[PDB]
Design a protein around this ligand. Structure first.
Ligand SMILES: Cc1cn([C@H]2C[C@H](O)[C@@H](COP(=O)(O)OP(=O)(O)OP(=O)(O)O)O2)c(=O)[nH]c1=O
Ligand SMILES: [Ca+2]
Ligand SMILES: [Ca+2]
Ligand SMILES: [Ca+2]
Ligand SMILES: [Ca+2]
Ligand SMILES: [Ca+2]
Length: 902
DNA sequence: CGTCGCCGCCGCGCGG
DNA sequence: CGCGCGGCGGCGA
């Protein structure tokens, strides 16, 4: 097989590499890598190396990596550019793997672990590590085994061995309900003392050294706790055994306020699942406890135990160990669903970077572009220093707040990357500038043609047309990968709807789910078999369709994020190819493209319907337009439609056969106007929205920019079995809005759009009546706990103190002098509740760490002093009034002349 | 060391 | 609660 790397590190003048050899064996080597860097040379001397601008370069081969670094410093002191890849391990990887990497994941050792630490005096700080580690569960992907290390004897209690028999039993039998599919995969090792547990763990680590190391909070907690505990007991050298090259670094993480120290383990790639989840999941959660994320992702019940975790080992060691094993497995289950490890490996090997560098798109694109340029013997420019400067972004149209009955949306495919490709925007393709007219002049086609030679953007930039730049070239490859996965995702989604439709008539029989590839549209023979299946088999198929859809979602959305991040990188000072002329050329072209096509769509539809000056486009943001279709529906008449699906088909056909061709003509004209290299403005229909036929639903509404709701029947070719709410910006979508409030507001909007004013008033009245019975967590707001110390004046709110920080300060005063109470962590999430006047907490609100029940010390007093009236008015009534005034509805029945009879 | 636009809640200081 | 400005948090693209 083709060799591939596992990990790479620079240590002094050595590269340390772990890799899989041609036989599929893991090896390690130390190479005294001789790096090359480059300097511009005279035009007359013969060379095969050229910088991106076509300037001749001479190669400088160095005796070692330290020489290369010192040369860079001398070139600065002289005042001359030192070209080439200064991250020597990326250059090593490029030299060693001078081909497209085919990797085999089954050869890569992925480790998932978590630890337990009993602590009677508060949170066990990793940097101190003064408490014994009493449990480690470490899953190995190559062995497919959970290795459990269990401490029987501790200064905090002597315990009996964990029983695998009781662990396997149901909770109703007094067992722990450890899933039966992992019971046979557990290798349990009890220890008489902590020293022997840790020594054995290190020996185990040595035999089965992680390549990818993951888990939940392993970077912030598990890794540093284990490193420091071993350091405190045995000394630094023993702790350094967690690195296969015995080198570690104790380094700070800096964003802004405060600092925390993480441990870098050389020769290991740490991918903390929390960080993977935060970057790749496209959620913002109220809580990041594993309980919370597990319940959200997998629909599994929280891990249930009595008393504080500080007493769980002592009171119920059996459950303590089982819950440690389950915690590890739950991260595995999330990953089997989300597939973030697979994504990381894919992106990592594609760019030829350390796998952990997937968190950094700048690093990712730096390596992609370097490998692409190196292939042609081209030399990358030196990184320069730039001051941060603001620059303009997208156009957002001010909507008229209103209800909107029939709506069709259109959207440009992968806009910013397509602008890059269409215009040919790259560092080496800059051709010059033209004199700029006001943007509205380009939008209205009255400004003079920018160039008869080069490809232009309305910001004044001009680009070569003879050849593709490296940025368009490399962004195209990833875009094409994105497109494949999106296709798989949408087909899985369409297949899902076929199963949903069939579930309305489930046949009664014992059968099995069909063995099908959900990434491809179901054939006719498959569709017919589904129609004859039982609810049980259909449900399993729906689950599988939905898992296939999620996998597709991960692959496509994160490839989209990567290509969009290349646009973003052009506007970040740390990017090698930072250039505000290029970033602005993209965003300005975008503003033109949107407003240009608004004009065209309006002009076209006014021609179709026979009017003048009527605005059909009601809204647009960046790359999408929202078109009012009332008049199109009205031109045939609502009475001519059999049912909802009929007018939906009509609009679908109208958009595809009439509007899209016109849209294309308008964009082809724009391409010619700007003299662009290639026409790539592809605007397809996205949503078809409206009320159910014969109902009093309003269909949709806008309250303002970025704030709207639509009742959607068809989304990019997916015809839904049941109409689906597209809600953007509104309180239903914010992680800060209480869960019960999100749910209620969503049902209010559902009723408005699908059923009408009367239905909405019924629901509101009922919600107002029953509100006070809602569980306190379901009605707590959520916020992020930033800058606590800034507004802390002696435990009391300082000037300008934010509402949620006031609540934290209240909490801190309430729990002061108690080691056992959960501390609020700087930068983490908190639940927030209003407090009635005259409460014993001495303030108007209280906040506590999210994902948790509030400590039993203050729970009783919070529930008694919770201000339901303020809660209802602020998080529910105010937003609903906002919705209803925008939609011209009343959420309370106004009096009428009829209130006079019967 | 991906980006900008723009919403609503809040504290503050008005607003005769 | 009437208003706008700046801080903040959090989305929508
Ligand atoms: C979501 C997102 C968009 N944008 C910018 C770039 C996008 O091209 C533009 C429009 O966003 P979107 O319409 O959300 O996405 P898209 O057009 O790039 O991809 P799709 O084919 O799925 O429609 O907004 C970012 O810069 N960063 C982001 O994270
Ligand atoms: Ca735990
Ligand atoms: Ca788009
Ligand atoms: Ca689309
Ligand atoms: Ca059937
Ligand atoms: Ca869009």
């Amino acid at each position: 097989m083709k060799e591939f790397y596992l990990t790479v590190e620079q240590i002094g003048d050595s590269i340390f590499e772990r890799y899989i050899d041609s036989n599929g064996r893991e090896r390690t080597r130390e190479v005294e890598y001789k790096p090359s860097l480059f300097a511009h040379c005279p035009e007359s001397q013969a060379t095969k190396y050229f910088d991106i601008y076509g300037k001749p370069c001479t190669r400088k081969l160095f005796a070692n990596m330290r020489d290369a670094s010192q040369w860079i410093k001398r070139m600065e002191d002289i005042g001359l550019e030192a070209l080439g890849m200064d991250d020597f391990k990326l250059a090593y990887l490029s030299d060693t793997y001078n081909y497209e990497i085919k990797y085999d994941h089954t050869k890569i050792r992925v480790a998932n672990f978590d630890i337990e630490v009993t602590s009677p005096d508060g949170f066990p700080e990793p940097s101190q590590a003064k408490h014994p580690i009493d449990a480690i569960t470490h899953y190995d992907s190559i062995d497919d085994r959970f290795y459990v290390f269990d401490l029987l004897n501790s200064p905090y209690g002597n315990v009996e061995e964990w029983s695998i028999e009781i662990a396997a039993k149901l909770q109703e039998q007094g067992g722990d309900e450890v899933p039966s599919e992992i019971i046979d995969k557990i290798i349990y090792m009890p220890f008489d003392n902590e020293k022997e547990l840790l020594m054995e763990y290190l020996n185990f680590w040595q035999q089965k050294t992680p390549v990818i190391l993951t888990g939940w909070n392993v970077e912030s907690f598990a890794i540093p706790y284990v490193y420091n505990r071993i350091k405190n007991i045995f000394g630094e050298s023993t702790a350094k055994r967690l690195s296969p090259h015995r080198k570690t670094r104790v380094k700070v993480i800096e964003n802004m306020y405060g600092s925390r120290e993480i441990i870098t383990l050389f020769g290991i790639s740490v991918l903390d699942y929390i960080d993977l989840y935060k970057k790749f999941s496209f959620t913002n959660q109220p809580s990041y406890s594993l309980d919370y994320i597990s319940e959200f992702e997998l629909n599994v019940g929280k891990l249930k135990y009595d008393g504080p975790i500080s007493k769980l080992r002592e009171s119920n060691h059996q459950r303590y160990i089982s819950y440690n094993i389950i915690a590890v497995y739950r991260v595995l289950q999330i990953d089997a669903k989300r597939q973030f490890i697979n994504l990381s490996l894919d992106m990592g090997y594609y760019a030829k970077i350390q796998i952990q560098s997937v968190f950094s798109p700048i690093k990712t694109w730096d390596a992609i572009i370097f490998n692409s340029l190196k292939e042609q013997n081209k030399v990358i420019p030196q990184g320069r220093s730039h001051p941060v400067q603001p620059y303009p972004g997208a156009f957002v149209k001010e909507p008229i707040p209103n209800r909107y009955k029939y709506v069709m949306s259109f959207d440009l495919t992968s806009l910013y990357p397509s602008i890059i490709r269409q215009v040919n925007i790259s560092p080496e393709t800059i051709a010059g500038t033209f004199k700029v007219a006001p943007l509205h002049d380009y939008i209205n086609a009255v400004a003079e043609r920018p160039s008869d030679v080069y490809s232009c953007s309305p910001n004044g930039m001009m680009y070569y047309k003879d050849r593709d730049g490296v940025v368009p070239t490399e962004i195209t490859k990833v875009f094409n990968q994105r497109k494949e996965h999106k296709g798989y995702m949408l087909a899985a989604q369409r297949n899902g709807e076929i199963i949903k439709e069939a579930l309305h008539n489930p046949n009664l029989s014992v059968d099995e789910p069909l063995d099908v590839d959900y990434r491809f549209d179901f054939s006719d023979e498959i569709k017919e078999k589904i129609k004859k299946l039982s609810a049980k088999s259909l449900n399993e198929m729906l689950f599988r369709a939905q898992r296939t859809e999620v996998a597709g979602m991960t692959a496509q959305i994160n490839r989209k994020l990567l290509i969009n991040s290349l646009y973003g990188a052009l506007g970040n000072v740390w990017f090698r190819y930072y250039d505000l002329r290029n970033a602005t050329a993209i965003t300005t072209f975008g503003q033109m493209a949107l407003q240009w096509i608004e004009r065209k769509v309006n002009e076209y539809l006014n021609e179709v319907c026979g009017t003048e000056g009527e605005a059909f486009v009601l809204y647009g943001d960046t790359d999408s337009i929202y078109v009012s279709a009332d008049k199109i529906i009205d031109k045939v008449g609502e009475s001519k439609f059999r049912d909802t699906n009929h007018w939906v088909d009509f609009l679908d056909k109208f958009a595809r056969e009439r509007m899209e061709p016109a849209i294309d003509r308008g964009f082809r004209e724009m391409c010619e106007y700007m003299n662009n290299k290639q026409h790539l403005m592809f605007m397809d229909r996205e949503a078809i929205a409206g009320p159910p036929l014969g109902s009093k639903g309003i269909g949709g509404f806008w309250t303002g920019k970025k704030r709207y709701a639509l009742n959607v029947w068809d989304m990019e070719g997916t015809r839904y079995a049941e109409p689906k709410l597209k809600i953007m910006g509104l309180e239903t979508q914010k992680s800060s809005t209480p869960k019960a409030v999100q749910k209620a507001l969503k049902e209010c909007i559902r009723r408005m759009l699908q059923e009408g004013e009367e239905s909405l008033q019924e629901y509101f009245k009922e919600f107002e009546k029953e509100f006070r019975q809602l569980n306190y967590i379901s009605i707590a707001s959520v916020s992020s706990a930033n800058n606590i110390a800034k507004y802390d004046v002696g435990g009391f709110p300082g000037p300008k103190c934010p509402f949620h920080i006031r609540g934290i300060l209240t909490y801190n005063r309430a729990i002061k002098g108690n080691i056992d109470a959960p501390q609020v962590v700087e930068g983490e999430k908190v639940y927030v509740l209003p407090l009635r006047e005259g409460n014993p907490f001495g303030d108007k609100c209280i906040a506590w760490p999210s994902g948790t029940e509030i400590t039993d010390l203050i729970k009783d007093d919070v529930l008694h002093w919770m201000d339901y009236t303020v809660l209802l008015e602020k998080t529910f009534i105010k937003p609903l009034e906002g919705f209803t005034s925008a939609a011209k509805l009343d959420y309370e029945k106004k009096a009428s002349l009829f209130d006079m009879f019967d």
